[PDB]
Amino acid sequence: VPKLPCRVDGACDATIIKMMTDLNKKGIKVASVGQNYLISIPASALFADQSPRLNWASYSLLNEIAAFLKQFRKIAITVTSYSSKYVSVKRERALTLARSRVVSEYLWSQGVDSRIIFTQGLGSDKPITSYTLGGDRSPNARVEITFRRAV
Amino acid sequence: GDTGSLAGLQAMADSKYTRAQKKQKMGKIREMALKETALSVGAQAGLAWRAKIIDEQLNKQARNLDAIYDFNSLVLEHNILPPVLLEGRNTLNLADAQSIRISDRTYKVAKQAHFITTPPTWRQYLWMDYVKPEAPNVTLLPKTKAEKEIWCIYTERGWKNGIDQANTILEENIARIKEDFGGMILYRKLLAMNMVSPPYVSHTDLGVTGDGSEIHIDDRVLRITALPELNVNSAEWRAAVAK
Amino acid sequence: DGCCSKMGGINYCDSSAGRLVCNNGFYSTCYCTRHAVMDLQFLMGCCLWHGGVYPQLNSSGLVVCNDGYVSEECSLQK
Amino acid sequence: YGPNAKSMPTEEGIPPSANDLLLHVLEGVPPPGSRRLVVSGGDARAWLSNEK
């Protein structure tokens, strides 16, 4: 018992449920089914308007994301980016790809023990709502992270 | 004293030195025993504590260690540990008078190459063994503040000596793993240089064999017939150039 | 030692993956058996990555592992 | 047959194939006459028979 650690390190399910409740009421979608977990971020709170640049206040939200991500034992994390149609196809494809690269690199720089980090963007080909009046304010412009908790 | 030692003997002629020396003699035969005990306990504590610190520090940078010390890339095609070679330059020996021997360079086979089952990592070379000791078992005890403070200072010296001993242990280990890795690198260099015969491995393979109770479907026998060794036919020595 | 705290409590310990199951359907953080996927990155004892401690009864301070190498780092000095 | 025995069982090149005990330890049967061991930290079982 002093020789064998009682649990995985730095873990408390009460902290897990409390911080995911705070995240859900703050505005980030958290979805749990089976052992798989999906977290969705609307883009307007993170980036600038049609821009692959990082707002300064978003670093706190990224740190909260990293703190919740630390509390799980993973193998592979996947990052997907999505947008609305603005000019072209490849313009928003590059915007999604660059945003995914940015968030993946900062996530790896922070301390999460992933083995695989996958990143890709899709542009404006997979909408979740046919209502498309807003631009970057529209909620279908988004970034998803998917993973599966293992054992 | 004995510096301006005529005056030193004249100071020894004074009687207060006599009544200091006579009381100090019985302490002199007494207090020296505790010093080695202080040295031993400081040595044990310092060695163990420095060992724990260096094992933690070694665990801190584990990924870069496997990054630099890739055994697994160095293996040959039939899972062969490469042999070890030693190179020396500018050899001179003086046997006696009327005897001087001169060599330009020399090479030595250290470990002949053989079969292997898994690439050895660094942990059998670089890990420091740790145990936890929890038994200060000292017969001696101080009596006065003088005994306490000399116990303190000799404890400090033993603590530092234990630290130095652990660091020397690390230095010996890192030298050993350095020479092993350098020998393998030099094998690759000389095999490119075409001064060493490659390993040569024969094989036979037989089909189904056994009795009516035991079978093996395919039974392959693999055996190495030629140990890698240096050649002395010097005319077949490959060159080198750069641009 | 509350493992399913802010949960429904402890249901039972699975013996396959060695994890507790809370009363809500989540795998808890705690372990529940010794045969688990459980990370160990530190060890004790002497003669590690060697033959272990030889079972001899040496009066001298040297202890030599079963591969024949001497562990002076655990062997007490003169 | 004479008063002295004779055979030629040399077989100088051929290695032994494998021990039969590997199949029993594959199926999970402990090898006979051995004793169990203690494994903790992974998902494994182990035994010690002939100091092997």
Give the helices and strands of chain A as they follow along the chain.
Answer: HEEHEHEE
Number of strands of chain C: 3
- Total helix count of chain C? 0
Specify the overall morphology of chain C.
Answer: rod-shaped
Could you describe the largest sheet of chain A, including whether it forms a barrel?
5 strands, mixed
Order of strands in the sheet with most strands of chain C: 1-2-3
Find the count of extended strands of chain A (DSSP E, 2+ residues).
5
Order of the strands making up the biggest sheet of chain A: 1-2-5-3-4
Structural class of chain A: alpha+beta
PDB class: translocase
Keywords: Secretion, T4SS, translocase
Entry title: Reconstruction of the Legionella pneumophila Dot/Icm T4SS 3DVA Map 1
Chain A: Inner membrane lipoprotein YiaD
Q: Describe it for me?
A:
The structure is cut from a larger assembly and holds chains A (151 residues), B (243 residues), C (78 residues) and D (52 residues). Chain A is 31% helix and 23% strand. Chain A is α+β, with helices and mostly antiparallel strands and 151 residues long. In chain A, a hairpin with a 2-residue loop joins strand 1 and strand 2. The two termini of chain A are 21 Å apart. By secondary structure, chain B is of the alpha+beta class. Chain B is 47% helix and 17% strand. In chain B, strand 2 and strand 3 form a beta hairpin. The longest helix of chain B has 49 residues. With 78 residues, chain C is mostly beta strands. In chain C, strands 1-2-3 form a three-stranded antiparallel β-sheet, with no helix packed on it. Helix content of chain D is 13%, strand content 8%. Chain D is built from one helix and two strands. Chain D has 52 residues and is largely without helices or strands. Chains in contact: A-C, B-C, B-D, C-D.
Brief summary of the model shown:
This is part of a larger assembly, with chains A (151 residues), B (243 residues), C (78 residues) and D (52 residues). The two termini of chain A are 21 Å apart.
